[PDB]
Design a protein around this nucleic acid. Structure first.
Ligand SMILES: [Zn+2]
Lengths: 72, 140, 189, 139, 57, 101, 139, 115, 54
RNA sequence: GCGCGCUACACUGACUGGCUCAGCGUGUCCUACGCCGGCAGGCGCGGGUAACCCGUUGAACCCCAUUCGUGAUGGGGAUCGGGGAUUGCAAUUAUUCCCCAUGAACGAGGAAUUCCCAGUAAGUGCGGGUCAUAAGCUUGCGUUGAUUAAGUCCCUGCCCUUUGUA
């Protein structure tokens, strides 16, 4: 079916990200975009911003797959 | 990243429905007579940040993009980019947009059909006009 | 000592079934730093038995037309996949791979005896090598196919597939196909 | 005081010049870690990890690579380094030490000392490749 | 100006071939067997092997 | 007497090796400084044409090879001696080109 | 510490940043508009591509000497995709390579060779080897 | 009427040189390479055929095998019989067709009707 | 007359070239300056010096 | 309406930038270097009848960053409008080549059917032949590099031996 994903964050999704993302077993642009109904670019930008704050660890960086994870 | 306060969901520019969701550089390719190359240079010449989404552009910015798209020559866009370089009638350099390109095409087709030039006759019959084999292929 | 990608140990890994104990290579004397060997393991018969199971996986990964000789990229797909595996489940990825191949292998197959057009099959046993072959083939086709036209990448799709396959989840393509093949053998007998 | 040997894979050739010194490791004037196909960096570190740095202590090797392709060059250079060391530990050390190196290198992978002889097979008329033939249409 | 070794060795080939074709069509009747050409910058010699030389002279 | 070089070029290997060896041993016995045979890359001329005149068959191809073997021998000897040593050595199926400086 | 001792990816970015900071590199009028080859579909994304290209050109000229406009056009060549026709190797733009070399000559980093090509100047070799120094220092 | 922002009345008086750049790249190259004898011979025939004609009635037909002649401001108004391989096709050269060839206005093959 | 007999230019093109043997202008081998038809070359290959090895 | 094929249907992917490796073999037409043009190309002056110069043949996939986000979309580039160059005496039924614009079918293909066992299949470029202009063709060369089999006469044919035949 047609997948109408959100280009920009809304308040109902943005507060949900800052609370819940921060603690998932595996961190990546794919699963975040799929679960929260986000666009690929915004979901990829969100993880970079969370790394700048310092809530999430970068496990390995690459072109194809960037893997993130919760700390402790 | 940040929540948009006044996200213009649909843009109404040059009698065209532009989707703000797509990034501005590729967003304006939806306009006929504008490709993925001419769009880029137009935005770069107006010194707008291409990173911005088409939905979050201010009134003055989109108005600048329209006025620089209409009259390219004034804003130092080179001669070799213009869609219409040497116009058969008046012989000037211009970039023709949606309605203009459709009007100019049907006019150019009419001009060729008027004089009974081979290309005109091949156009009027609904055949190929670049001299391909029309036997084996090009069905319907 | 020797560790896969210099960060995964090959001593803490354990084989379950004795049948495949000499047909899954990953052990002390087969411990390699990378999957990429460029050996002559398809030179004659029963030589690929001595191929590292990680190499067999990354070799069977570069399958479809556009990626036929693109090994250097399957090695990094498997590297990322192994990292994703470790992040999700916690324990050694090589154990998860072995568990996946142990579960995924069909034990009783069906062979064609009769004419073409009509279907008439005899249910027969499967050799330990053929069990390993089909297991790897099914895992890769499940990964590949699952991630073909959707956003999740091949790396996390292969990981997801091996997570499901290792703990015998019905969601795994490899488990569904094994189940069906054994059910068809059960239908014939 | 020095020895000079070649490692070969397909049409790739890597010549390693081994002399005495401070455990220097350079290929075409570049360190191993700075070689372009970084994905296979470990393949260059194979001979130095297997034997241990202590054996390389009193040896400077200078490798120069020509011909072949990227991975073929990687297999040429990693073969050349090991062949250079065993040649040096043959000529200016006891044979016992050379055997103590050789057995470990062979026991890991035979490719490190013995060259992979197979080459790109000749193409024949009637097809695109050496075996494959063009499509044969009946009616 | 001088031609390449490749073109030169080819040229000598055609010379041999054409000379043979001419000699065959001329001395067929006198059983022309074969020819041998030795080349020296002083002067190049052509040696005709035929059944009855008395006639070909 | 300065730097005469001798370029021996042939299609046969045996005749070329024989004649060049004779030139070398002929020069060596006279006590002349000689730089030995410099073997250049063998030039292989390839022609690949259809077997058939008409063009009806299974599309078979001939493969015609032509080999050119080139040897250089260099002498530091006088032109008078070089002329006679180059003169004596003649063979049908070798081309000799002598150059000075 | 030398250019060969450091990573060649980070080195270009460092040298590009230095060439930007100098603020005396004569950029053409058509940087905003023109492509970088016959076979590129779009203009380069980065606004400061001229500095990265200039940096790359200097690094190439450091690694081997006697490199003309033709050689530089051969360096920045790629795969021309011809739609339904199969893809062939296409060469870079000559003008961009010429203007880059002219612009670097402007800095007195590169000068013309008596043999015919262009070699890096001792001032250039200094600058390049210095940049390598701090790129190495940043680990 | 106008061609490339130039009305016909000053196309006529305009000389051979500055007419070159007004035309498209192909014709410009052709005029740069210069016309041979038969092209001039045709022009002479056409200007004579026009000169001898009445001022009201159209010039008498000039027949030709030259399909590869470029239309010039001189040739506007002329009656040209262009050879199609079999027969001659009569064309009145209008002002609007000042860029093309004669060959384009005389079709060689009959349009295909299927059965 | 004199200016229409062989008047058409033949500096280039398939008509300008011809086989050195049979004067045919089809399937012509013009590599290494052979300048000979493919049929004629196959006949004269042996005595030219071209040999069939592999 | 059929028969060889080439490009695709995308995220193991496109796009932009950076990094780093060939082999066969051809040049009286092969081309370095300098200048001008966005580009196709335009001028000027050199080397090579060739392990000598092009050339250390800085090739492409691939490798490492950037942007894109399942949307007939930044997949795909067919068809069409303008221009600007090179061959050639001559380019229209457009010879090739470049630039801007236009943005079709195509979401892996029914019955059916081809080719192939290791440096093989396949992906991927390069040279030769045609060649004034010139490769979606064939003929060669490297480059990255597999899955499955070490068997059978079931289908399609083949060889030998027995018989049977109008
Ligand atoms: Zn002939």
């Amino acid at each position: 079916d047609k997948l109408n994903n959100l280009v920009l964050f809304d308040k109902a999704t943005y507060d949900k990200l800052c609370k819940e993302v921060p603690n998932y077993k595996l961190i990546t642009p794919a699963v975040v975009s799929e679960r929260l109904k986000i666009r690929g670019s915004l979901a990829r930008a969100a993880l970079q911003e969370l790394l700048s704050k310092g809530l999430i660890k970068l496990v390995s960086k690459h072109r194809a797959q960037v893997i993130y994870t919760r700390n402790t | 990243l940040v929540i948009p306060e006044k996200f213009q969901h649909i843009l109404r520019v040059l009698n065209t429905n532009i989707d703000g969701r797509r990034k501005i550089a590729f967003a304006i390719t939806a306009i006929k007579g504008v490709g993925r190359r001419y769009a880029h240079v137009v935005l770069r010449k107006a010194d707008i940040d291409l990173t911005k989404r088409a939905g979050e552009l201010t009134e003055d910015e989109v108005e600048r993009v329209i006025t620089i798209m209409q009259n390219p020559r004034q804003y130092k866009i080179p001669d070799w980019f213009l869609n219409r370089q040497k116009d058969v009638k008046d012989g000037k350099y211009s970039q023709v947009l949606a309605n203009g390109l459709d009007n100019k095409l049907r006019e150019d087709l009419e001009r060729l059909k008027k004089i009974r030039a081979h290309r005109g006759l091949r156009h009027f019959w609904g055949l190929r006009v670049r001299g391909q084999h029309t036997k084996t292929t090009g069905r319907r | 000592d020797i560790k896969l990608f210099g960060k995964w140990s090959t001593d803490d890994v354990q084989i379950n079934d004795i049948s495949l104990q000499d047909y899954i290579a990953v052990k002390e004397k087969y411990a390699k730093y990378l999957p990429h060997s460029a050996g002559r393991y398809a030179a004659k018969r029963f030589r690929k038995a001595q191929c590292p199971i990680v190499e067999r996986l990354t070799n069977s990964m570069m399958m479809h037309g556009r990626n036929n000789g693109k090994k250097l990229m399957t090695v990094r797909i498997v590297k990322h996949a192994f990292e994703i595996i470790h992040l999700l489940t916690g324990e050694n990825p090589l154990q998860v791979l072995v568990n996946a191949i142990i579960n995924s292998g069909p034990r009783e197959d069906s062979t064609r005896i009769g004419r073409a057009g009509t279907v008439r099959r005899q249910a027969v046993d499967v050799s330990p090598l053929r069990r390993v072959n089909q297991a790897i083939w099914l895992l890769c086709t499940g990964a590949r196919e699952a991630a073909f036209r959707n956003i999740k990448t091949i790396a996390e799709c292969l990981a997801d597939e091996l997570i499901n396959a290792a703990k015998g989840s019905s969601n795994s393509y490899a488990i569904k196909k094994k189940d069906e093949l054994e059910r068809v053998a059960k239908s014939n007998r | 005081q020095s020895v000079q040997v070649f490692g070969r894979k397909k049409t790739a050739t890597a010549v390693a010049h081994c002399k005495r010194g401070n455990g220097l490791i350079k290929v075409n004037g570049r360190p191993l870690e700075m070689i372009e196909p970084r994905t296979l960096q470990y393949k260059l570190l194979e001979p130095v990890l297997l034997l241990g740095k202590e054996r390389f202590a009193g040896v400077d090797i200078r490798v120069r690579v020509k011909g072949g392709g990227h991975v073929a060059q990687i297999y040429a250079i990693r073969q050349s380094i090991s062949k250079a060391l065993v040649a040096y530990y043959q000529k200016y050390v006891d044979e016992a030490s050379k055997k103590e190196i050789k057995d470990i290198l062979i026991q890991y992978d035979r490719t490190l000392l013995v060259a992979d002889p197979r080459r790109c097979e000749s193409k024949k008329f009637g097809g695109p490749g050496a075996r494959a033939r063009y499509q044969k249409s009946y009616r | 100006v001088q031609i390449s070794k490749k073109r030169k060795f080819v040229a000598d080939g055609i010379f041999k071939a054409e000379l043979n074709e001419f000699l065959t069509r001329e001395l067929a009747e006198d059983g022309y067997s074969g020819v041998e050409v030795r080349v020296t910058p002083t002067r190049t010699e052509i040696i005709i092997l035929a059944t009855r030389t008395q006639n070909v002279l | 007497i300065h730097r005469i070089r001798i370029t021996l070029t042939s299609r046969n290997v045996k005749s070329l090796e024989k004649v060049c060896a004779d030139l070398i041993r002929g020069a060596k016995e006279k006590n002349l400084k000689v730089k030995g045979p410099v073997r250049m890359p063998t030039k292989t001329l390839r022609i690949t044409t259809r077997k058939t005149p008409c063009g009806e068959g299974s599309k078979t191809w001939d493969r015609f090879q032509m080999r050119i073997h080139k040897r250089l021998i260099d002498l530091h000897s006088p032109s008078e001696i070089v002329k006679q040593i180059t003169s004596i050595s003649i063979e049908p199926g070798v081309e000799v080109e002598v150059t000075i400086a | 510490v030398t250019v060969k001792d450091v990573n060649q990816q980070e080195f270009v970015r460092a040298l590009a940043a230095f060439l930007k900071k100098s603020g005396k590199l004569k950029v053409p009028e058509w940087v905003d508009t023109v492509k970088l080859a016959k076979h590129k579909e779009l203009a380069p994304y980065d606004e400061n591509w001229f500095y990265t290209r200039a940096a790359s050109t200097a690094r190439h000229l450091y690694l081997r000497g006697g490199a003309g406009v033709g050689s530089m056009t051969k360096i920045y060549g790629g795969r021309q995709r011809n739609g339904v026709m199969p893809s062939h190797f296409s060469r870079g733009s000559k003008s961009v390579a010429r203007r880059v070399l002219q612009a670097l000559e402007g800095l007195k980093m590169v000068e013309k060779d008596q043999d015919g090509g262009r070699k890096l100047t001792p001032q250039g070799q200094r600058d390049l080897d210095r940049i390598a120094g701090q790129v190495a220092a940043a680990n | 009427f106008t061609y490339r922002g130039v009305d016909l009345d000053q196309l006529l008086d305009m000389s051979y040189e500055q007419l070159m750049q007004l035309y498209s790249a192909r014709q410009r190259r052709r005029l740069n390479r210069g016309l041979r004898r038969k092209q001039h011979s045709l022009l002479k025939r056409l200007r004579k055929a026009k000169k001898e004609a009445p001022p009201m009635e159209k010039p008498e037909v000039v027949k030709t095998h030259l399909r590869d002649m470029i239309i010039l401001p001189e040739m506007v108004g002329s009656m040209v019989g262009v050879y199609n391989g079999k027969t001659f096709n009569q064309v009145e050269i209008k002002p609007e067709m000042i860029g093309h060839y004669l060959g384009e206005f005389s079709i060689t093959y009959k349009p295909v009707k299927h059965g | 007359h004199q200016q229409l007999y062989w008047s058409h230019p033949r500096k280039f093109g398939q008509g300008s070239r011809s086989c050195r043997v049979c004067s045919n202008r089809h399937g012509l081998i013009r590599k290494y300056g052979l300048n000979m038809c493919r049929q004629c070359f196959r006949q004269y290959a042996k005595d030219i010096g071209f040999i069939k090895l592999d």
